[PDB]
Every structure is written in C-alpha cells, then in structure tokens.
Design an enzyme around this catalytic site. Sequence first.
Site, short mmCIF file in Angstrom:
data_model
loop_
_atom_site.label_atom_id
_atom_site.label_comp_id
_atom_site.label_asym_id
_atom_site.label_seq_id
_atom_site.Cartn_x
_atom_site.Cartn_y
_atom_site.Cartn_z
N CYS A 44 1.71 37.50 8.19
CA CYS A 44 0.78 36.60 7.52
C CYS A 44 1.20 36.55 6.06
O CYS A 44 1.81 37.51 5.56
CB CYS A 44 -0.65 37.15 7.64
SG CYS A 44 -1.89 36.29 6.64
N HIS A 45 0.91 35.45 5.38
CA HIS A 45 1.27 35.32 3.97
C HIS A 45 0.71 36.47 3.15
O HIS A 45 1.28 36.85 2.13
CB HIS A 45 0.77 33.99 3.40
CG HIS A 45 1.69 32.83 3.65
ND1 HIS A 45 2.46 32.26 2.65
CD2 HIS A 45 1.96 32.13 4.78
CE1 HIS A 45 3.16 31.26 3.16
NE2 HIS A 45 2.88 31.17 4.45
N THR A 46 -0.41 37.04 3.58
CA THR A 46 -0.99 38.15 2.84
C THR A 46 -0.06 39.36 2.86
O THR A 46 0.08 40.04 1.85
CB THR A 46 -2.37 38.52 3.39
OG1 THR A 46 -3.25 37.41 3.19
CG2 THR A 46 -2.95 39.73 2.66
N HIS A 66 -1.23 43.03 9.73
CA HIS A 66 -2.63 42.99 10.13
C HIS A 66 -2.92 42.00 11.26
O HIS A 66 -4.07 41.76 11.60
CB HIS A 66 -3.54 42.71 8.92
CG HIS A 66 -3.25 41.43 8.21
ND1 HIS A 66 -2.07 41.20 7.54
CD2 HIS A 66 -3.99 40.31 8.05
CE1 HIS A 66 -2.10 40.00 6.99
NE2 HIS A 66 -3.26 39.43 7.29
N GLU A 67 -1.86 41.41 11.81
CA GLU A 67 -1.99 40.50 12.95
C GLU A 67 -1.24 41.20 14.08
O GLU A 67 -0.01 41.12 14.16
CB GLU A 67 -1.34 39.13 12.68
CG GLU A 67 -2.07 38.24 11.68
CD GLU A 67 -1.53 36.81 11.67
OE1 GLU A 67 -0.35 36.62 12.03
OE2 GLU A 67 -2.27 35.88 11.29
N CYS A 96 -19.11 47.88 11.93
CA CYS A 96 -19.80 49.12 12.26
C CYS A 96 -21.11 48.79 12.97
O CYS A 96 -21.64 49.60 13.74
CB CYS A 96 -20.08 49.94 10.99
SG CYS A 96 -21.46 49.35 9.99
N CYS A 99 -24.41 48.66 9.10
CA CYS A 99 -24.59 48.49 7.67
C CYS A 99 -25.40 47.24 7.34
O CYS A 99 -25.75 46.45 8.21
CB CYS A 99 -23.24 48.45 6.94
SG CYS A 99 -22.27 46.93 7.17
N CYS A 102 -23.45 44.04 8.41
CA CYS A 102 -23.38 43.84 9.86
C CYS A 102 -24.73 43.41 10.41
O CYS A 102 -24.81 42.60 11.33
CB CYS A 102 -22.92 45.13 10.56
SG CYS A 102 -21.16 45.53 10.40
N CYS A 110 -18.42 43.64 6.89
CA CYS A 110 -18.83 45.04 7.04
C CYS A 110 -18.26 45.85 5.88
O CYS A 110 -17.07 45.74 5.57
CB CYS A 110 -18.30 45.58 8.37
SG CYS A 110 -18.56 47.34 8.63
N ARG A 114 -14.77 50.12 3.60
CA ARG A 114 -14.02 49.29 2.64
C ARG A 114 -13.25 50.14 1.60
O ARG A 114 -12.06 49.89 1.34
CB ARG A 114 -14.99 48.39 1.87
CG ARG A 114 -14.28 47.35 1.01
CD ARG A 114 -15.25 46.45 0.25
NE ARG A 114 -14.95 46.36 -1.18
CZ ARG A 114 -15.80 46.72 -2.15
NH1 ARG A 114 -17.02 47.20 -1.86
NH2 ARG A 114 -15.51 46.64 -3.46
N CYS A 173 -5.71 37.29 12.62
CA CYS A 173 -6.01 36.73 11.30
C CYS A 173 -5.94 35.21 11.14
O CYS A 173 -6.97 34.55 11.04
CB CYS A 173 -5.09 37.35 10.24
SG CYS A 173 -5.45 36.76 8.56
N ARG A 368 4.30 30.66 12.68
CA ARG A 368 4.13 32.07 12.97
C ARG A 368 5.31 32.61 13.76
O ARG A 368 5.79 31.98 14.70
CB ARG A 368 2.83 32.31 13.76
CG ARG A 368 1.60 32.50 12.88
CD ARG A 368 1.74 33.76 12.04
NE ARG A 368 0.54 34.06 11.27
CZ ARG A 368 0.11 33.35 10.24
NH1 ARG A 368 0.80 32.29 9.84
NH2 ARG A 368 -1.00 33.69 9.60
O1 LIG Z 1 -15.21 43.30 3.01
C1 LIG Z 1 -14.71 43.03 1.79
O2 LIG Z 1 -15.20 43.50 0.65
C2 LIG Z 1 -13.53 42.12 1.48
C3 LIG Z 1 -12.95 41.50 2.73
C4 LIG Z 1 -11.64 40.79 2.42
C5 LIG Z 1 -11.57 39.44 3.10
C6 LIG Z 1 -10.90 38.38 2.25
C7 LIG Z 1 -9.58 37.93 2.84
C8 LIG Z 1 -8.44 37.99 1.83
C9 LIG Z 1 -7.09 37.58 2.44
C10 LIG Z 1 -6.63 38.47 3.58
C11 LIG Z 1 -6.73 37.79 4.96
C12 LIG Z 1 -5.86 36.55 5.11
O3 LIG Z 1 -4.52 36.92 5.24
ZN LIG Z 2 -20.83 47.31 8.99
ZN LIG Z 3 -3.90 37.50 7.01
#
Ligand SMILES: O=C(O)CCCCCCCCCCCO
Ligand SMILES: [Zn+2]
Ligand SMILES: [Zn+2]
EC number: 1.1.1.1
Lengths: 373, 373
Positions: A44-46, A66-67, A96, A99, A102, A110, A114, A173, A368
């Site tokens: 993913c670009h992230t 993460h994918e 979870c 929280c 959730c 959630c 974090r 993702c 992808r």
């Molecule tokens: O639960 C949190 O505080 C933050 C959750 C982060 C979600 C924002 C997504 C940011 C880009 C990553 C996913 C896309 O590749």
């Molecule tokens: Zn939660």
């Molecule tokens: Zn992503």
Amino acid sequence: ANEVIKCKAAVAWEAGKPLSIEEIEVAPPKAHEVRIKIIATAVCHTDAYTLSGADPEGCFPVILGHEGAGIVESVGEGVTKLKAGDTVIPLYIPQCGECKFCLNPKTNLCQKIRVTQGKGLMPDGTSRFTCKGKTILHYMGTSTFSEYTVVADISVAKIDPLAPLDKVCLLGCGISTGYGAAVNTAKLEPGSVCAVFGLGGVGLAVIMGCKVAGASRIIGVDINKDKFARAKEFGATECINPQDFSKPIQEVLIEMTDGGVDYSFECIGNVKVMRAALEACHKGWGVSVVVGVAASGEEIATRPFQLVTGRTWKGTAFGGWKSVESVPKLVSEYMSKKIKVDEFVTHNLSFDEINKAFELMHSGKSIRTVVKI
Amino acid sequence: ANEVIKCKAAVAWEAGKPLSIEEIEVAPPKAHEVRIKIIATAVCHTDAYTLSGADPEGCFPVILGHEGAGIVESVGEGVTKLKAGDTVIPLYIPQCGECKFCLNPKTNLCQKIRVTQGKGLMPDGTSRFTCKGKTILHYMGTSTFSEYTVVADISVAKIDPLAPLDKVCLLGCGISTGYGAAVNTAKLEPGSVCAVFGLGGVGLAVIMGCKVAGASRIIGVDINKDKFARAKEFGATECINPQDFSKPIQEVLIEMTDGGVDYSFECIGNVKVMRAALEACHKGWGVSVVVGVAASGEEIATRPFQLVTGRTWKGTAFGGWKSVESVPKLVSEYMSKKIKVDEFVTHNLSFDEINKAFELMHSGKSIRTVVKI
Ligand SMILES: O=C(O)CCCCCCCCCCCO
Ligand SMILES: [Zn+2]
Ligand SMILES: [Zn+2]
Ligand SMILES: O=C(O)CCCCCCCCCCCO
Ligand SMILES: [K+]
Ligand SMILES: [K+]
Ligand SMILES: [Zn+2]
Ligand SMILES: [Zn+2]
C-alpha cells in the site's frame, strides 16, 4: 508448547532503503496474541510512505506491510475465538469491542492498543521480532511482510475458509477503505452524482462502492489517462484529465454537473486536490470525503462560505468499517460476487522480489501487486 | 390601485457613517412583489458588518435590516396567497418552492432570486426605493429599516395573526439561525456534549437549540465573561473564557470532555476560532458547524488528519430552515412556549434612535435591540 519460529521476513533496516529479506526469529504468542502464517501480502502507498522516511512517526528497524491474509499458526493464553488453522486477515484498525469508540456506532477507531501499536510494539510493550541480535519493530499492528507475524488478538478477522488469500489480502486496506468511504462515510443515495480524485486502488474501490450504491454518474479524475480504462471497467461513467483544462478542476466539475457533484472523494492525499474536491461539490448539499493520507504538516483550506452554503467536509479511516465485524462480511461479499477483488490485482511476485512491488507502485504501472510469501 | 408611499427610512448613504433618517418614496408592488408595513425590526451583526464597510460586496446607498415583522400593506400583480392585512416576516432566504434547491430536502438555499438580491434589487432588476432623486438599494431582499418595504413574493412568511411583532421580528435571523443550526444542521442527539463559540444572540439561540434537543453538556465559550450569566440562563452547563487558559482552547475543551465535544458551533465569523471549534470536536464522530454570520473574507484550515480520524466540518445559513414553511412554525413554537424569543430582547428603541442600536451592539453590551417603527 509454542516455540520460537525462525523464518524469513522483509526487514526495513533504515528509511530510504529497499527492504531486505532476512532470517528472523518470531517469538511465540503471549497472552491475547495470535501468531499468523502470512500467505499473501500486497503493498500500500502507506507502506512506501513510511519506508521513505517521510513519516515523522516511522521507526526502524521494522517489518512493514498491512495488507495481508494468512492462517492462524497458534494463539496465546486467553484466546478462545481463534485457533490454529483459522483463515484470517490482520487488522491495523482493531476492534476490542469494549472501548468508548468500539461501543459508539459512529466510529471504527478502536483505541485499546493504539499507543503501543504506534511504537511498533505488542500491547504488553514489547516486540515479538528479532533479527541478528536486534529488536525489529511491528508496523501498524500487522507486519504482514513476514512468513509469520504476531498480532493483538483484537487485530484479527476470521474469514471464509474458502477465500483465496492471494486475493482477499487486498481487503486488508485499499479495497475496504475505498469501498467503505462510499457506502459508510458518504452513504450516497441511488442516483447520486459522484467525482473520484485519484484512480489508483483506493479510487477504484470508491467507484466500485458508488456503483454498488447505484450512483447515476461517477466521474473519475486523474492526470494519468492510462488509469481511465480500468476506472470505467469499475463503473466510472466518464473520466477527466485536469491537464486538459485551463481552469480549476472544481469549475470543470461544477460546469460538468450543473452546480457540482453530490459526493466527491479524494483518494490521493494531496491537500490541494482535497480543496478542489470539496469545492467541486454541489452547493447546499454537496459532501466531500477525504480518503487519502496527506503528508504530515500539510493542511487543507477553503473559504468558510463553502460550508455555510451547504457543503460538508468528511474523512474516513479504513472505510469506517468496524474491522473484526466487517472484514469477514466483505470477504463474503467478494465470494458472492457482490464486490470485486481480483480486478485489483495487476501484478504478482514472489517474496524475494518484494522490492519490485514498491517500484511498480512508484512507476505507477500497477494498482496492486500481490506478493506470494 | 397602489400608490407611491412617502415614508421614513434609515438610509445608509455610505459606509462607516451613522444611518440617516430620511423621507423616502417606496414604489408600489410590481408583479409578484409584496409591500410590507414594518412594525418592528432589530439589528443583527450582519447589518453592522455591511455598514462598517468591512464587507467587500457591500453597496451604498442602501436600506439595511433583515430582522423584521410587519403587516402586508398591498400585493402586486399575480399575488394570490398574500393579501393586505396578513401578518408577515420578511425572509432573506426565499423559498420559491420549485427550483432544484427548494425541491431538495437537504437544503433551504433557494436560488430563484439570488443574483438580483445580491445586487440589492428586486427580481426584475430594479429598486423600489428612492430618496432625494437618488435610487436606494434593497438589502438582503428585506430592507426592514423602513416604515414600508417591498420584497419578492417568495421572500414572505405568513405568520400567526396573534404573534407579538415587537418580538417575533427576531425570528427573521438570529434566533432562527442558531436554533436551526442545532436541530437541522447538527441534528444533535439527546445526551450530546456541545460547545458554542460566541455567546451573542446567535450563540444563545444555538444553546437553546441544544437544550431543546436534550444535550447533556453545553459549554459556552466567549472572551467576554459578561455574556456568561445569560448563557447559563439559556441552558449552558458552564462557560469558559479562552483567556483564562494558556493552552489553545481546543486543548482545554478536549481535556474537559475526555476527547472533545460531539458538536461545536462557531457563531462569531472568525476563521481562527472556526478551526479551534473543529479541532475541539471528539475524534471519530465530532461535528463542527460554522454558523453563517459573516463573509470573513479569509479562509479556514486544519490538517486532513482531523477529518480522516472522524471529525466533520459543516456550515449553515438561516439554520437550514426552508424559510416560507418554517418561520410560521417557529412562530408557533414561540407561541406554544417551546422556544424563547422575549429573552433575547435586551433593549428597546424608537425608529429615530436606530443608530443607538448599532452602538449597543459594538460595545457588546446587548443581545438584541428591538426598534419600534
Ligand atoms: O485509531 C487511530 O487513532 C488512528 C487510526 C489511523 C487511521 C488513518 C489511516 C491513515 C493511513 C493508513 C491506511 C491507508 O494506507
Ligand atoms: Zn476498541
Ligand atoms: Zn494502507
Ligand atoms: O447565496 C445563497 O444561495 C444563500 C446565502 C448564503 C449566505 C449565508 C447567510 C449569511 C448572511 C449573514 C447572516 C444573517 O445576517
Ligand atoms: K448520505
Ligand atoms: K446528528
Ligand atoms: Zn427555490
Ligand atoms: Zn442576520
């Protein structure tokens, strides 16, 4: 009992460098953790963003990704919902289910783990990865670029045992985020006029979602015309290239829809495009959804008049899907052909060639690239 | 046979100068126009804003005023639903009932006569006001600062004949806007946690709306502590002066509510505060509403992250009330004691002392000054 596992993993030793296939050690799952055998993963670009060193939150050494999609290899103490053999997808947005977030129907963010996840650690504050005597960090609670990863037990979605993992890993993702941005965040009505900025994986999923929602018009926007064909295959009624016009893209869309679109989605992470995406929305009821992740520091802007006269600015993380609940259903929607997944796969590679997935992304030749572990 | 009417009016010959009580001529109603005898009118910050000259599109000479109540004096050709003697309230937000905006439930921004109205003219492109051989422009389609005014027949709300006009004139803007921002735009749910920035007439009306919707915490925010007492009276659970804290106000509110408010309303027209109001909203589901009161001229900004992680930026005009059908109902709610109006009136003046109404406002020692024609 559960022993330490010696396997291979694509380690990111340092920012700005390519990934390195290393021999690593994966500790057994501790209480409320599950070790997963990753079968397929994608980029993913992230992942690339963090790898570049541009992410002020990124730390090394670390195992990205993460994918992914795999099989539960073993579970830690206290885990009863999951067991060895279960078909699963790792989740960077956990659930979870207890929280504040959730429990609130309006969000999927959630917050239970974090803090530790941001530090690339398991809930107990430690990492389960080591390599050549060094501690290797977890990434986004998933670290799918490994033959085996360990995640919090609340970061797991148990899916259909028949789902092809070399496909559904994309639901980790991209597809889910774009699809959800349309059906969860925007909740566009049948007949809606939509505009999608950025025709990459996420953008295509947005179009997919807009078509599932029954949008009357879906205008794809991208400076790269090569992406138009696939955008149309996904449901885009038409595509426009900003470079073909001499005036603000917002004006082009406004004139094109007699006032503006009912819904716009920015799937690039470009603040300037986000503004244009908002201003391209129809006066009075237009809604713009920011799906792309902008580089730190960058901020969006517009004139309050845009909001006062009816436009709404929204955003979304992982398509607003409460992860544990939704992902299994999304896999079922793919299985029943309600949504597309296979169409997103433009390239396939082996684990050793994982770096080419990153290269194919930058070249923007693919949507992808699925990496076979 | 309607004749020209010689009457008194408060004319703004130029900006930055006190209104001039002049003897003017008010032409009879042309087709689809209505001439109203203004009985009571009040001053809104917007009127003063135009007068100050700080408004880019403010044009002179003009007859200001958009919060008024009166009696239909005569109707033009084609007018069937209104007649002499009808109790009415002029509307700066019309409702033709047939354009695409009026037909859409998501908005109240009728565009039928926007263009001409923005130029201080009736739908036919001309003004009904003259004074000393000079044409005087209409304002916001209402020009209530006159013994007699002429408005488009779609800029008229017919109200309960028993309604005290020296009161319901405030429903022409301030009260209705704030109240609607809470119940139409935000549509806050019972138990909601709110924050209102700016405790003037609009803010108090937002507080009233939050109270009607069953909000749990309503935090008033204003740098002028003198406005706190009345805010409490309207329902504010507490008020805070941003000046009593070193940290940014959004951080203070976030700390007070364990994450931020569910809904925030900016009722000042300050883009910096608008950003604070947005960031003061709770992650995941926070919603901030910019209450239309200015045309600040500048732009608002924040980091996309705020939206991506769940917050929503909205705006509102005249509280999102489809004017012609809503104003009558709002009057009925006031009559039925569902909402307050009388509590907004802090001062009373005669037409000749109208300039004093502007003074009381700039000194922030007052909420609403009702001017008796
Ligand atoms: O639960 C949190 O505080 C933050 C959750 C982060 C979600 C924002 C997504 C940011 C880009 C990553 C996913 C896309 O590749
Ligand atoms: Zn939660
Ligand atoms: Zn992503
Ligand atoms: O331009 C339109 O269609 C509708 C008008 C949008 C303007 C919002 C109203 C703000 C005017 C000042 C507040 C009342 O004194
Ligand atoms: K919707
Ligand atoms: K709501
Ligand atoms: Zn209309
Ligand atoms: Zn006003």
